[PDB]
Amino acid sequence: QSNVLFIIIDQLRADCLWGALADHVELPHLRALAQDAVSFRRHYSVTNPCGPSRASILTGQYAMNHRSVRNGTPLRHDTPNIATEMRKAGYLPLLFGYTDTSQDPRAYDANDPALKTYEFPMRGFHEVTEMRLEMSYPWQSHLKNRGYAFDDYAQVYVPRPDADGTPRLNGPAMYRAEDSDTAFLTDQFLANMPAWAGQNWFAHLTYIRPHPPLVAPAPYNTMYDPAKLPLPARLPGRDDETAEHPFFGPATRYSSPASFVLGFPDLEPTDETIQTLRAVYLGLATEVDTHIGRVIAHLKETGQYDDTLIVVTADHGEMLGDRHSWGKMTVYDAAYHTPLIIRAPGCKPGHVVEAPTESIDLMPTILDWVGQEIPNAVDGRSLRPFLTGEAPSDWRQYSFSELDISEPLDPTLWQQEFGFGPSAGAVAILRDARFTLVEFAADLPPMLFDHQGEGEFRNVAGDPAHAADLARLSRQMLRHRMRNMDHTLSLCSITHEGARTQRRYD
Amino acid sequence: QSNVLFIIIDQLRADCLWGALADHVELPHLRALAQDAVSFRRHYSVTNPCGPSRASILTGQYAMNHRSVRNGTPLRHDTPNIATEMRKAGYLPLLFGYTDTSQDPRAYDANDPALKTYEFPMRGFHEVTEMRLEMSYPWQSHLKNRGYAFDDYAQVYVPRPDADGTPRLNGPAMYRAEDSDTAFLTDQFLANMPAWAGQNWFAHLTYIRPHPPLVAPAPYNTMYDPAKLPLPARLPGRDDETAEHPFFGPATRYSSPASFVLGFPDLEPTDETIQTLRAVYLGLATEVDTHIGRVIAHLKETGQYDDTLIVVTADHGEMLGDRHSWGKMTVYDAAYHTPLIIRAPGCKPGHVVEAPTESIDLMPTILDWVGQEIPNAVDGRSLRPFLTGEAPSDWRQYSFSELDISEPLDPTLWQQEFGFGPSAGAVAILRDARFTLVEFAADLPPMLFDHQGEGEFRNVAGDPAHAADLARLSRQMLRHRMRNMDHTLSLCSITHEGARTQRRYD
Amino acid sequence: QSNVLFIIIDQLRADCLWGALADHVELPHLRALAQDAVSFRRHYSVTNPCGPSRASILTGQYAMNHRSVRNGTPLRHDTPNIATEMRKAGYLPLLFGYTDTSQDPRAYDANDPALKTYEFPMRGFHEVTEMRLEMSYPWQSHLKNRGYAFDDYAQVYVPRPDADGTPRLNGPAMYRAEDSDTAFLTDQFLANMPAWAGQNWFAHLTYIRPHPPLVAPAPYNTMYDPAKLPLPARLPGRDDETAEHPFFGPATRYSSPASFVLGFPDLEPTDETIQTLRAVYLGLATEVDTHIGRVIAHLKETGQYDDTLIVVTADHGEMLGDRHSWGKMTVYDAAYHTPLIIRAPGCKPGHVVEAPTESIDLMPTILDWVGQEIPNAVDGRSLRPFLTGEAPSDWRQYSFSELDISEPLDPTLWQQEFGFGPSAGAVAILRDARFTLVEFAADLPPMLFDHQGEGEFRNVAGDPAHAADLARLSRQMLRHRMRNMDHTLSLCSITHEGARTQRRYD
Amino acid sequence: QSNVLFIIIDQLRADCLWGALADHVELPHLRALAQDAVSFRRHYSVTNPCGPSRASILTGQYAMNHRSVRNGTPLRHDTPNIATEMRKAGYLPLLFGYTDTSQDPRAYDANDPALKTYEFPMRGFHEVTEMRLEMSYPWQSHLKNRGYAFDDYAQVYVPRPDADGTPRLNGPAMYRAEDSDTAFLTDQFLANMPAWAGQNWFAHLTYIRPHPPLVAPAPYNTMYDPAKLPLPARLPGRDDETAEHPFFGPATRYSSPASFVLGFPDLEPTDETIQTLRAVYLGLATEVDTHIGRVIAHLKETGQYDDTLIVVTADHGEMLGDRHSWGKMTVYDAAYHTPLIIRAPGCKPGHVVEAPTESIDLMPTILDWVGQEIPNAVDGRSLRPFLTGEAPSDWRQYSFSELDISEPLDPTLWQQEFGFGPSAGAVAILRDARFTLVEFAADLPPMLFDHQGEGEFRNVAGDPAHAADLARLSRQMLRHRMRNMDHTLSLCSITHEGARTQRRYD
DSSP states (O other): EEEEEEEEETHHHHHHSTTGGGGGGHHHHHHHHHHHEEEEEEOOEEEEEEHHHHHHHHOOOOOHHHHSSSSTTOOOOTOHHHHHHHHHTTTTTEEEEEOOOOGGGSOOOTTGGGGGGOOOTTTTTTEEEEEBTTTTTHHHHHHHHHHHSSSGGGGGSSOOOOOTTTTOTOOSSSSSSGGGGHHHHHHHHHHGGGTTSSOOOOOEEOOSSOOSOOOOOOOTTTTGGGSSSOOOOOOSHHHHHHHTOOOOOHHHHHHGGGGGGSSSSSOOOHHHEEEEEEEEHHHHHHHHHHHHHHHHHHHHHOOOOOOOOEEEEEESOOOGGGOOOOOSSSSSSSBBOOOOOHHHHHHHHTOOEEEEGGGGHHHHHHHHHHHHOOOOOOOOOOOOHTTTTOOOOOOOSSEEEEEOOSSSHHHHHHHHOOOOTTTTTEEEEEEEEEEEEEEEEESOOOEEEEETTTTTTSSOOTTTGHHHHHHHHHHHHHHHHHHTTOOOSTTEEEEEEEEOOOOOOO | EEEEEEEESSSSOOOHHHHHTTGGSSOOOHHHHHHHHHTTTTTEESOSSSHHHHHHHHEEEEOOHHOOOTTTOOOOOTOOHHHHHHHHHHHHHEEEEOOOOOOOOOGTTTTTGSOOOOOOOOTTTEEEOOOOOOOOOOHHHHHHHHTTTOOGGGGSOOOOTTTSSSOOTOOOOOOOGGGGGHHHHHHHHHHHSSSTTTTEEEEEEEOSSSSSOOOOOTTTTTTTTGSSOOOOOOOSHHHHHHOOOOTTTHHHHHHHHHGSSSTTTTOOOHHHHHHHHHHHHHHHHHHHHHHHHHHHHHHHHOOTTEEEEEEEEEEEOTTTEEEOOOOOOOSSGGGTOOOOOOOOOOOOTTTTEOOOGGGGGHHHHHHHHHHOOOOOOOOOOOOHHHHHOOTTTOHHHHHHEEEOOOSSSOOOOOOHOOOOOOOOOOEEEOOOOOOOOOOOSSSSSOEEEEEETTTTTSSOOOOOOGGGHHHHHHHHHHHHHHHHHSSSTTEEEEEEEEEEESSSOO | OEEEEEEEEEEEOHHHHHHHTGGGGGOOHHHHHHHHSEEEEEEESEEEEEHHHHHHHHHOOOOOOOHHOSOOOOOOOOOOOHHHHHHHHTTOOOEOOOOOOOOGGSSSOOOOOOGTTTTOOOOEEEEEEEOOOTTTTTHHHHHHHHTTEEEEEEEGSSOOOOOTTTTTTTOOOOOOOGGGHHHHHHHHHHHHSSGGGGSSSSSEEOOOOOOOSOOOTTTTTTTSOOOGGGGOOOOOSSSHHHOTTTTTTHHHHSSSSGGGGSOOTTTOOHHHHHHHHHHHHHHHHHHHHHHHHHHHHHHHTTTTTEEEEEEEESSSSSOOOOOOEESSOSSSSTTTTTOOEOOTTOOOOOEEEEEEEEGHHHHHHHHHTTTOOOOOOOSSSOOHHHHOOOOOTTTSEEEEEEOOOOOOSSHHHHHHHOOOOOOOOEEEEEEOOOOEEESSSSSOOEEEEETTTTBBBOOOTTTTGGGHHHHHHHHHHHHHHTTOOSSSSSSSEEEEEEEOOOOOOO | OOOOEEEEEEEEOHHHSSEEEEESEEEEEEHHHHHHHEEEETTOOOBBBHHHHHHHHHHHHHHHHOOOOOOTTTOOOOOOOOHHHHHTTOOOEEEEEEOOOOOGGGGGGTTOGGGGGOOOOOTEEEEEEEEETOOHHHHHHEEEEEEOOOOOGGGGOOOOOOTSOOOOOTOOOSGGGSHHHHHHHEEEEEHHGGGGSSSSSSEEEEEESOOSSOOOOOTTTTTGGGGOOOOOOOOSSHHHHHOOOHHHHHHHHHOOOSSSSOOTTOOOOOOHHHHHHHHHHHHHHHHHHHHHHHHHHHHHHHTTTTTEEEEEEEEEOOOOGGGGOOSSOOOSGGGGGGOEEETTTTTTTOEEEOEEEGGGGOOOOOOOHHHHOOOTTOOOOOOHHHTTTTOOTTTOOOOEEEEEHHHHHHHOHHHHHHHOTTSEEEEEEEESSSSEEESSSSOOOOOEEEETTBBBTSSOOOGGGGGHHHHHHHHHHHHHHHSSSSOSTTTEEEEEEEEEEOSSSS
């Protein structure tokens, strides 16, 4: 009677659902859901990459609090999360896919498998289908049982070359559409959900696609013509990007078209190459949509659609060639701006939210809706007021994101160039109505983007005419960090009668 | 072979040992130790009051990390501390006094005595003598057994009135000097240490005095003439103090001479009153000094002096009427500037350190000296290079302190006047060679004190001529927060072979 | 290169593989494995029912040590088990089916799903396929997706009635053979194991069948003619069984043919009924065998058969009408005597073991073979010496089993009749070469079965001619309990240099 | 309002307070308390020695359950004890002395001081004064400060030799009576208890004396003439003792007069020697008595006597030359029979209890009286009904004791002579109204003592006339083990609504 369906699409841009790229991709099921629900237009990931972003989404805390700042950085074992809190509400959190959680070494034996991968499922989640990108054993066994020939898992991602053996960038995937990673995970959800109907269930479905190595099964590989797509938003050359801030030198080098596909090691970043990858990515998104329609159809068929809290989002964005860069290890909005659709029984269908919302607001929304206590450790705030077309009077007027550009055992390109250590790798972003401020822990100058001017296309931090804006935004950023320190026990008080707690948000 | 003697005097100002007040107080044993050891002249508490400031000293972390931000705010049970780490080195940490540790409610039964007091001993410490200000059962029993008449513990702190019954502000204490709180604790140390000689011991001895309720046993009560003491450093009136920044309104109103003594509820803050309290305070510091000489004499007599790491400091300072304020719930240096003497076998005797040192540097110094691994959670750095007259090239160039002006269950005077909640109570101080910057989490403007100008006697943050200094120092403060986030697991990495760690400090 | 395949068949009698019933059932794959491996002929479960038996098999301890004495009795969270110990060896224990583990309430939130079922998976096991008898959600969803009509899970177990609607006892199951519980679990193993090939895997496959509610899909339902089967071994009537020991009154009443099937509430225990249930049970065993052949074929096809430790056993026996009783809540051998086949690279193929072996010997055998330390808590001993046709000189000369006939919240039929409480429900069995002794914690007399006389068909404990045998066996039983008390820390010693441990078995 | 005073005298025989030795020793304060309270005449320790016997008293469990079976054998960290349970009731358990608790290696760092001694204080106890026999640092420091000359702690226990330097067996102790171990501990209790008056306190005071090395300060050393004392109860020679059962060979050889004193390595067990040790022991018991009178006087003086639950007992007994043996590593009653006096407001003064009581009954009595839930793990039963002169109808009809004659790292004299390992060291004793039965885990025959015949002076287990009594008592012993298995979670049940518990005791 009270179900929770939490879908995370890895790496889908907000502008593909609504915005600059929306008219160049077919997303009917996601657009039909938005039409029958609440869409959040100013929704941003609080951190990057995949690991820190998921840690934040699943714990409801900023990276400065949860401290799983990089892929492989452990998360404290006693950190309250959506699964642990939903278990207190009597739910068995069902997992279809991955959580990308780096386990606490203090909670396991040194030789335990859980400490050998940063793709490991988070404490509290009950895994029904394991579908981690680097280990998709059920999907790999499915392809082997289907009669697909592959001596290595990496061979599965190589696009089919031409008849003459010539490698083809947008060549169809070695697997048919019905045997794809997207189709298979959806099939596993539909093979396991029927018996859960009637009881209160919590299902967490995580789609990797669209995501590198970029390959799509027939007909999605060529469904979109690269020649009819818009070119990425970028300055004329890679050196013009690096000229805006020295940070962009390592950023445009971190990822490339050559690292986003398998079988093309010497791949040149030409307009033909860039547009092909862009078309493959969009085809993978239409494939995800198609399979999401089947998930929705199942809820309607079982009469469970109206009695379910549906949460659809993307973990982080993707540059997609924008600003001569790929991936999400950068400071531009496209790496953080993510779609968010929430359907709840009695919500305002077709309602569009313009207020800044954060990835950390998801966990408290779910707990609020089920009627479970939100821990004080949670930095995020429930989006429930927005569901009935309203809003809280004391809402955020800016959004905040973090990044870490250090790696403890293998120094990053930024560390090799600028010479900072792994305690000074933190980057912070503050998105104000007019400005975007970027501040580094390391000895790198701030970035300032004026949306009333050139926007993200010009770093104006060195301009003395913007000194008062720079000082005001940086104090606003300083205050945010001071107002959002670890609240696990900071609102508890030791009194003569015992320990007494104060609720963080009223 | 390797002993550790860690003495902490509560509320002793740095300027009493060396500085403005040094010539008005006799501290021969502390000054003799400084002459035979290393003195740290720019040593500051990283937080306040007692509880937070004790949590920082004993954990080696900033309050932003340990999160025991106010008296009664719980400290995480799994937080590494000097006692837990010394236990790994094979030491039994002996406690003579108090730690003022607010226990983790998650680690105890709801009705446990440990959760009813914020004066409770820290995990790992083995208590030999209990001597917490609000308790002191061994000392209270010593007083009853010696035949002192008192129906309430609060009666013990009331100064002896005149023969005619007239209350006397600097009246001698009810107890004789040999029966005092200072004498009794020293006697308990000397009644228990003889059998520890020969074995490697770690003793932690904590003197409350000098500390309110201000009362000194004969002859200390009147040893210093209030009429011959210098007046406090202050602006002419209370309104001049508060005109500098609104924070000082509630800050000068938080403590008073009337709250620093027992039996004078209507006590007027006259110059006669202020100077009397100041003379009583200095008399208690001299009595602490005489008893510390007995502790040193014991080490020399047993031939344990040369083979012992001696650490002598104060937890925090005391305004003592300076700037029309009392206590340590403020932002001025007198509340944080603390004496620090370190004697180690082979140190440079009489060496004076001018580099900025922090209270969090004590725990890593002890661990380094015993040869025990310093946890990555520790924000402080070992002072060991300074002991042989050297100094690390990458050492601190500024000091950092924090305060919390909010109370979750009982709103403070600042909360009542300024309207902020318990998530916005944080204050931060950055002490640069020239400037001191104060920044609030709440919507209160910064403070800026120029030490080449009027010093602390003028807040220059609103002066346009200091706008560039203000912006530069605030970025330096922002970077400090970003460079010192929780390091418990942030330097650990999940690899294909298991979890691997990176050492924080060089 | 070093794999572990651990198969548990729930409720299969030892005499079906080799013995009295072997010639009346086809088990070719299990018999082919025995021909190419080591068979253990005197193998007994140390406890009953399913829960305590599994607890013992998975922990390697007697019920007197693990204390999970009934279905629903919690097992201590820190109890070392095969999964926790295999995780230390670097294995991810893969679960296909169930463990029937009652979780520790001290380790979970009061409202957690893990505390609402005693079928919950054991700590350390990674569940790939959930197949718990009372909740087979993947199998129930498979039947629903296949187009099977059922409004209740209990309807799935009702045998197909005749054309005219007349209920038929050995009617075929509502599901076809390819859609059965046995077939489905085997399919899930084969859908997930291919990608594990090459790496060291540990797979735990648990078959419920043969087990009530007795129903078999076509053609297994009628494959064996009830008219050509031998009748159960029993005294002439139910009252003759109860006359041997008053214990047998509640035992023959606990289970019945009517409780072993669904859709026959008034089912009479006629010879026609008893033989039909017996034929259905044997058909379910041939179905299990058939699917085990597919598991073996997969290992051979992948070239993983010779490099795998294969362990095949049954958890507990089944009375199957023997002694006018059904199930395993009794003291006769048929309830405990279980098949055991172990194949290891380099073992003696076709070797038959006659020495008494216990269910607790499985966990130490696996750990020994992988080269992982066996905890001292483990009461069982490695069967590795028997694999090369040898045996240890200090082996057991008797086997030991336990049962609990109390229920804390709902008093059993034994408690209602004899009037004992839930601290006196323990029963103990000692199987000597000649005698079997049964001793009760409650005020019920012992049982003594002389195999050189009438065997289990006559309780001779009241015969004064057997007083010396009774006294000798009871002292042997007393000594066994005293020699097998909780060894978790009893072999550890606190010394002046620290804690030192002594290995339980050399 | 509700105080708990728990005094434990180490090694005081029951027959010294009332019985065979009572007329040869002055115990006025203990006898005055018995006259104003309830005395338990059939009170026995459930295990031995000190460590196991202290673990049973403080946990309320049999050694078969708590498993700290020898000195140095760790006790599980999560074992509920009197201190942990009293902390739930809001009490701070104050310790004056020792608990002799072997800590759990799983709960501490490998190098922790707590894992280097089996005299370490039990979890939950708040140590006020440390006074363990192998340590006693406060008492050793009291001795150095008072000016006693000793270069080694062992020199303190050497009796003062004659003027000519001739060693004297009953020579006065080096220290004066006012400086003794007994006097000093009492002084520490009285120096710390005054400030606890008014509040609800729980004080645990543990006197080592009477206990080896046997030495008494003047005038106690010679207060009793060894020539006027009765000789021990024994068979004529050592070989007569050992002829009764081979166990007594190593048991009479384990301790001797030479091992019960310091400075006499070649001490002959003559009647003069034996009687001298006996007179010294009785003199130390009289000195314990004088100091207990001061503890009682304090309660009366403060008006806290009538409002306090007073529990006075001994941990175990002492052979004292009886049966040619010393100490408590034996099976005779003198090693277990201990005095027990309980005073509670409203009890029947002068009431004498004859029912069998056990050391495990103390913890549940205290918890019951304070109104705190008794855990199911507790094997003991509250003695509260007996306090008002009543007796439960389902009370004990026999008492049960255990011993362990094995040592994991250093094989005992029994292991060396009989050849059994450290899993077979358990001994069990059952005291019936007429018989005493002794059963070994190792292959040693039982002992049977008829109290209507020769008592303990003849082992009658081999007599055919006692074969039926032997079999009956051994079944009663078997049933006791089966009725008292670990109850930590065995009465908890996993249900569809969660975990539900059943109360152990009626």
